[PDB]
Short mmCIF file of N, CA, C and O and ligand atoms in Angstrom, two decimals:
data_model
loop_
_atom_site.label_atom_id
_atom_site.label_comp_id
_atom_site.label_asym_id
_atom_site.label_seq_id
_atom_site.Cartn_x
_atom_site.Cartn_y
_atom_site.Cartn_z
N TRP K 1 76.36 -93.11 34.03
CA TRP K 1 75.72 -93.99 32.99
C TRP K 1 74.45 -93.25 32.50
O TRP K 1 73.92 -92.39 33.21
N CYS K 2 74.01 -93.58 31.28
CA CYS K 2 72.99 -92.89 30.49
C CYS K 2 73.24 -91.37 30.40
O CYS K 2 72.33 -90.56 30.59
N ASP K 3 74.50 -91.03 30.13
CA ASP K 3 75.08 -89.70 30.07
C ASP K 3 75.87 -89.59 28.76
O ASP K 3 75.91 -90.54 27.97
N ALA K 4 76.49 -88.42 28.54
CA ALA K 4 77.33 -88.15 27.37
C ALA K 4 78.57 -89.06 27.28
O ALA K 4 78.97 -89.40 26.17
N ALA K 5 79.14 -89.46 28.43
CA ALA K 5 80.28 -90.38 28.50
C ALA K 5 79.89 -91.81 28.10
O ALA K 5 80.60 -92.42 27.31
N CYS K 6 78.74 -92.28 28.60
CA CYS K 6 78.11 -93.56 28.24
C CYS K 6 77.87 -93.63 26.72
O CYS K 6 78.28 -94.60 26.09
N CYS K 7 77.22 -92.60 26.16
CA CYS K 7 76.91 -92.53 24.73
C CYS K 7 78.15 -92.33 23.84
O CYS K 7 78.21 -92.92 22.77
N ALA K 8 79.16 -91.58 24.31
CA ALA K 8 80.47 -91.49 23.66
C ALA K 8 81.21 -92.84 23.62
O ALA K 8 81.70 -93.22 22.57
N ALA K 9 81.21 -93.56 24.75
CA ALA K 9 81.77 -94.92 24.87
C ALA K 9 81.04 -95.94 23.97
O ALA K 9 81.70 -96.74 23.32
N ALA K 10 79.70 -95.86 23.93
CA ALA K 10 78.85 -96.68 23.07
C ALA K 10 79.10 -96.43 21.57
O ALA K 10 79.13 -97.38 20.79
N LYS K 11 79.29 -95.15 21.20
CA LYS K 11 79.64 -94.71 19.85
C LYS K 11 81.06 -95.16 19.44
O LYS K 11 81.23 -95.68 18.34
N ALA K 12 82.04 -94.95 20.33
CA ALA K 12 83.44 -95.34 20.11
C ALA K 12 83.69 -96.87 20.10
O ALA K 12 84.51 -97.35 19.33
C1 ZBR Y 101 70.69 -95.01 28.81
C2 ZBR Y 101 71.93 -94.76 27.96
C3 ZBR Y 101 71.95 -93.74 27.00
C4 ZBR Y 101 73.11 -93.48 26.26
C5 ZBR Y 101 73.10 -92.31 25.27
C6 ZBR Y 101 74.24 -94.27 26.49
C7 ZBR Y 101 74.25 -95.26 27.46
C8 ZBR Y 101 75.51 -96.06 27.75
C9 ZBR Y 101 73.08 -95.52 28.18
#
């Protein structure tokens, strides 16, 4: 969390 996967999921 608060990583590139978190921000990719938030964007998607
Ligand atoms: C703290 C944080 C930052 C991003 C880019 C995304 C998430 C889910 C949390």
